[PDB]
């Protein structure tokens, strides 16, 4: 076919039930993971792609970076509940990556502060249970496909995206193929 397991696309051997339909995972810390965000707008144009009534999550995870890593996971779940993913994303991904101005928690909490956060707000959210469990449901879904690679995702919790097995000569060509193969499983 066109389409074919273990090209395009991986089956999970051991389906996840009840998972979110379009299952991203991240770390401020992985090089392709800002190259996705960056450069190809990945989570983007899947989702210009999507039928409607389609949820889209994207989660961050702690097996890069130790310390910070987790620290980031905790700080991706203040930004969930805020609401203020589209504020801080760019930022803690160059603060990591590019000028390397995050290496502990309280640069992390400052990207937010920059981004017109509230100190007293921030602070409340990170210690809030409400938070605890954002980042458990994080860790949680990871842990429920066994994930020890990022970038990552993965529809109906049943099939992985497999990027290695698409065309990398034209960056542009990559992104469409990759979103049409998240349309072709969303539609399984």
Same mark, same amino acid.
């Given at each position: 076919?066109?389409?074919?397991?273990?090209?395009?696309?991986? =089956?999970?051997? %051991?389906?996840?039930?009840?998972?979110?339909?379009?299952?991203?995972?991240?770390?401020?810390?992985?090089?392709?993971?800002?190259?996705?965000?960056?450069?190809?707008?990945?989570?983007?144009?899947? %989702?210009?792609?999507?039928?409607?009534?389609?949820?889209?999550?994207?989660?961050?995870?702690?097996?890069?970076? *130790?310390?910070?890593?987790?620290?980031?996971?905790?700080?991706?779940?203040?930004?969930?509940?805020?609401?203020?993913?589209?504020?801080?994303?760019?930022?803690?991904?160059? *603060?990591?990556?590019?000028?390397?101005?995050?290496?502990?928690?309280?640069?992390?909490?400052?990207?937010?502060?920059?981004?017109?956060?509230?100190?007293?707000?921030?602070?409340?959210?990170?210690?809030?249970?409400?938070?605890?469990?954002?980042?458990?449901?994080?860790?949680?879904?990871?842990?429920?496909? /066994?994930?020890? *690679?990022?970038?990552?995702?993965?529809?109906?919790?049943?099939?992985?995206?497999?990027? /290695?097995?698409?065309? =990398?000569?034209?960056?542009?060509?990559?992104?469409? /193929?990759?979103?049409?193969?998240?349309?072709?499983?969303?539609?399984?």
């Amino acid at each position: 076919a066109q389409y074919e397991d273990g090209k395009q696309y991986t =089956t999970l051997e %051991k389906p996840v039930a009840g998972a979110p339909q379009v299952l991203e995972f991240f770390s401020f810390f992985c090089p392709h993971c800002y190259q996705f965000e960056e450069v190809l707008h990945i989570s983007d144009n899947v %989702k210009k792609k999507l039928p409607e009534g389609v949820k889209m999550t994207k989660y961050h995870v702690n097996f890069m970076g *130790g310390d910070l890593g987790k620290d980031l996971t905790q700080a991706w779940a203040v930004a969930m509940a805020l609401g203020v993913e589209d504020k801080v994303t760019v930022p803690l991904f160059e *603060g990591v990556q590019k000028t390397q101005t995050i290496r502990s928690a309280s640069d992390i909490r400052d990207v937010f502060i920059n981004a017109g956060i509230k100190g007293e707000e921030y602070d409340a959210a990170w210690n809030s249970f409400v938070v605890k469990s954002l980042v458990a449901q994080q860790e949680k879904a990871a842990a429920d496909v /066994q994930l020890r *690679g990022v970038p990552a995702m993965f529809v109906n919790g049943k099939y992985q995206l497999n990027p /290695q097995g698409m065309d =990398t000569s034209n960056m542009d060509v990559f992104v469409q /193929q990759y979103a049409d193969t998240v349309k072709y499983l969303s539609e399984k």
